[PDB]
Structure 1
Amino acid sequence: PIVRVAVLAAGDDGGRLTEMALPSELPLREILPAVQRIVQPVRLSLAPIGGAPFSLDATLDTVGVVDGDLLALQAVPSGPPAPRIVEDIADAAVIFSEARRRQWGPTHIARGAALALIGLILVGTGLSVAHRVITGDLLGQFIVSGIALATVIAALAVRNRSAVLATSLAVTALVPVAAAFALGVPGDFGAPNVLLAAAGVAAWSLISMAGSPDDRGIAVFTATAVTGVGVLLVAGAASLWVISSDVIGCALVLLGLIVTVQAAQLSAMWAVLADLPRRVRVSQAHQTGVIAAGVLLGVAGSVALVSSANASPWAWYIVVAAAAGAALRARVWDSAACKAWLLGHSYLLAVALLVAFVIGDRYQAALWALAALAVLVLVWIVAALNPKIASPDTYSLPMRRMVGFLATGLDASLIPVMALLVGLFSL
């Protein structure tokens, strides 16, 4: 009745991993000397990876061991070592509060200076943009072109010195870069002004992701690069022509749909094998970036179709169909952040529609937007409380095949509905 495992022990120098055939239906204190003799204080015991070590009174089949599992030698977790008792309350306050890392030091001041700098940049952009839009002035663009150039040369200057302040400054620098490229060629807020702003944002994101050392930032830079290219494309199409009668929103919805379904081919476009634990992480981040744009562009036009009142009901269908299309791809993506973006696309849609109906002064479907968001948080609560409904290991196979075919058909329907809504087929 034997079972074969592989045991893992790392205490001396590195770690040894060895196959063996342990006899089952014996308590583990009898076969622990065998494995301890093989792969080699405190009494050790076998442990599943990521769990408490096995109690020695149990056997390998009462607790569950499969043929081929990976078992690690871990110490017995016995208990806590006699917590201290002091009665002088002053000594009980100086002694028991040392688990605080409370030393001020020249390492909290660095985080304070970095956060103070990012706060300065964001509040200067906010002050000057609010001064430019609440008045008519040319000192606002003056100080924005000052601060944005300051952040770009600062993020480029401190790059090979700390590499954490560099990418953080480069992430927060694309808000004043967006403002400075948004205020040029003034007009009255412009149609090509958002073209220039998105061009500057995508250009600066490409510069920084080209010069970034490693990960933790490739996701946000790739996301803002793809949505900068998308807004640049649709603003070029709405600036070099005159047709703007809700042609922006459907084009952005189709662009978000394209960068959502063709995200695997698009995400590997940017790319001894020893630098593999870097590379795939970078590639994973690139994936998430495009999927973030697959929401963001996919909500940015999705507001513009339902922007004004009394709009066409095909736009009302295509925004909910785009929501269900970007929410029914929440099971094909392996990672957690991609699934989180694709599930939060509907939440972002309801919040952006609520702020649209607040800005447009409607106040009647804004409460309906809150109601749809209440429906979304209620279905989140239903999926979270009893953790059995949203599980593919309890759903039968042809039923999930039919739901997959529903998700295959639902994201093909919005393309001709867009083609008839714009007037391409109504010629």
Structure 2
Amino acid sequence: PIVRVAVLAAGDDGGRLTEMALPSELPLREILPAVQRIVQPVRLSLAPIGGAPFSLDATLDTVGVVDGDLLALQAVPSGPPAPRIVEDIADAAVIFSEARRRQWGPTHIARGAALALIGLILVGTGLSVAHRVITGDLLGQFIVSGIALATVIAALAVRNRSAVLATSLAVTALVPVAAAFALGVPGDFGAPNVLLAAAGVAAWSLISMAGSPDDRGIAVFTATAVTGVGVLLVAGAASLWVISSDVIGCALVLLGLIVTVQAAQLSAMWAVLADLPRRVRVSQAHQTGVIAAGVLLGVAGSVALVSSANASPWAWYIVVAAAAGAALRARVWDSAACKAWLLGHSYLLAVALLVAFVIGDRYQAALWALAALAVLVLVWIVAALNPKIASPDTYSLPMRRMVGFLATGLDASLIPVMALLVGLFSL
């Protein structure tokens, strides 16, 4: 009754990995001496990678070894930690408090200054625009451009000196920049201004994604870039050709689902094997952002279709259909943040309608909108208690299949509906 397992002993230098086959149905205390001679004042034992050491009395059967798992060679757990004892209550405050990482140090000040700065820029911008939107005077556009230009330089100025402040200072640079261009030829907050801005951030972003020396700040750039580009076209074509009473979003939700359904390929579009780990995450970061572009777009017009009153009964089903489609399109996405993004599409959209009615003075659908959130929250909870309805393993295969034709049967089955709202084929 032998079983083939592989142990791992790494205490001396790097590590030594061999495998073997071992006689089951015994107290591990008998076979421990053998392995100690192959691979190699304390006592040792065997443990699965990720678990606690196995008792010296159980057998490799009753402790549940499958023939081919990778055991490690760890130590018997511990003894007591031998608690210290100090009687003078005075020194009982200085002694038992060191274990904090409390020292002020000239690095709590580094994080200090930058965090102060990012606040200065933000409210520095918002003041001038508030000096510009609720009243009118262009002195702001002097100050907007002043700070907007300044931060532009600083990120380019510490690209190779901090390597973390840099990428942080870039992401905040686009708040005043998007504010600056949005101020040329104002209008009433303007029709074509939103065209000028989508050029700006899409400009500023693309310059910096390639400007990042490493990870940690890539995904936020990628997502807003495609978001800028995406809104640019459907704003440009909206600036001259089409009057588009309501069909800006009909372009968006179309463009939205298009980006979400076609997501894996777009990530690949941005593309010794030693630098594989660096390449694999950036690839993942690219995907996780790109999907956010989808959801944020998916609502971007969807928040405008059912926005005002007097909407269409086909308009109400034009958004709901999209939501479910994206919600059931998650089961294909592996990572965690990838899942959450599309999963909470309905959540994000739910609140949008609420504020819309409260700011639109409706006090009718507002309450409903709040009742349309609980239903979505309630299902989240029952998904959390028992890992049963969340786990598709305790299902049926045609159920796993039916959800398929269910999925592709609706996420695309709205383009005929789309032709109704605008009435594209009523002409």
TM-score by length of 2: 0.97
Structure 2 gaps, min length 5? none
Distance change (3 Å), C-alpha of 1:36 and 1:157: same
Cα offset, 1:322, TM superposition: 1.2
Cα offset, 1:335, TM superposition: 0.6
1:274 corresponds to 2:278: no
* Count of equivalent residues: 427
Cα offset, 1:361, TM superposition: 2.6
Cα offset, 1:61, TM superposition: 1.4
SS across alignment from 2:109: helix
Please give the root-mean-square deviation of Cα atoms over the aligned residues, in Å.
1.3
Inter-partner Cα distance in structure 1 for 2:191 and 2:35: 73
SS across alignment from 2:73: strand
SS across alignment from 1:57: coil
SS across alignment from 2:392: coil
Cα offset, 1:282, TM superposition: 0.3
Structure 1 gaps, min length 5? none
Aligned to 1:58: 58
Cα offset, 1:251, TM superposition: 1.0
SS across alignment from 2:159: coil
Aligned to 2:158: 158
Cα offset, 1:240, TM superposition: 2.1
Inter-partner Cα distance in structure 2 for 1:208 and 1:228: 14
Deviations 1:152-207 (A, max 9, x none): 11111111111110111111111111111211221111121112112111111100
Cα offset, 1:386, TM superposition: 2.1
Between stretches 310-319 and 29-38, larger displacement belongs to: 29-38
Cα offset, 1:409, TM superposition: 0.8
Cα offset, 1:70, TM superposition: 1.4
SS across alignment from 1:74: strand
Inter-partner Cα distance in structure 2 for 1:146 and 1:353: 37
Inter-partner Cα distance in structure 1 for 2:13 and 2:399: 52
Inter-partner Cα distance in structure 2 for 1:300 and 1:79: 60
Cα offset, 1:89, TM superposition: 2.3
Distance change (3 Å), C-alpha of 1:235 and 1:266: same
Inter-partner Cα distance in structure 1 for 2:3 and 2:181: 67
Cα offset, 1:102, TM superposition: 0.4
Deviations 1:198-242 (A, max 9, x none): 211111110010111111111111111111111111111211224
Cα offset, 1:5, TM superposition: 1.4
Distance change (3 Å), C-alpha of 1:66 and 1:355: same
Distance change (3 Å), C-alpha of 1:79 and 1:369: farther
SS across alignment from 1:89: coil
SS across alignment from 2:87: coil
SS across alignment from 1:350: helix
Cα offset, 1:357, TM superposition: 2.4
Inter-partner Cα distance in structure 2 for 1:31 and 1:184: 80
Cα offset, 1:40, TM superposition: 1.4
1:295 corresponds to 2:300: no
Inter-partner Cα distance in structure 1 for 2:292 and 2:362: 29
Between stretches 131-140 and 283-292, larger displacement belongs to: 131-140
| Identity across matched positions, percent | 100
Inter-partner Cα distance in structure 2 for 1:181 and 1:45: 67
Inter-partner Cα distance in structure 2 for 1:80 and 1:401: 55
Inter-partner Cα distance in structure 2 for 1:328 and 1:41: 57
Distance change (3 Å), C-alpha of 1:415 and 1:85: farther
Inter-partner Cα distance in structure 1 for 2:212 and 2:292: 19
Distance change (3 Å), C-alpha of 1:151 and 1:358: farther
Cα offset, 1:327, TM superposition: 0.9
Cα offset, 1:108, TM superposition: 0.6
Inter-partner Cα distance in structure 2 for 1:79 and 1:196: 68
Distance change (3 Å), C-alpha of 1:60 and 1:119: same
Between stretches 222-231 and 39-48, larger displacement belongs to: 39-48
Inter-partner Cα distance in structure 1 for 2:125 and 2:385: 43
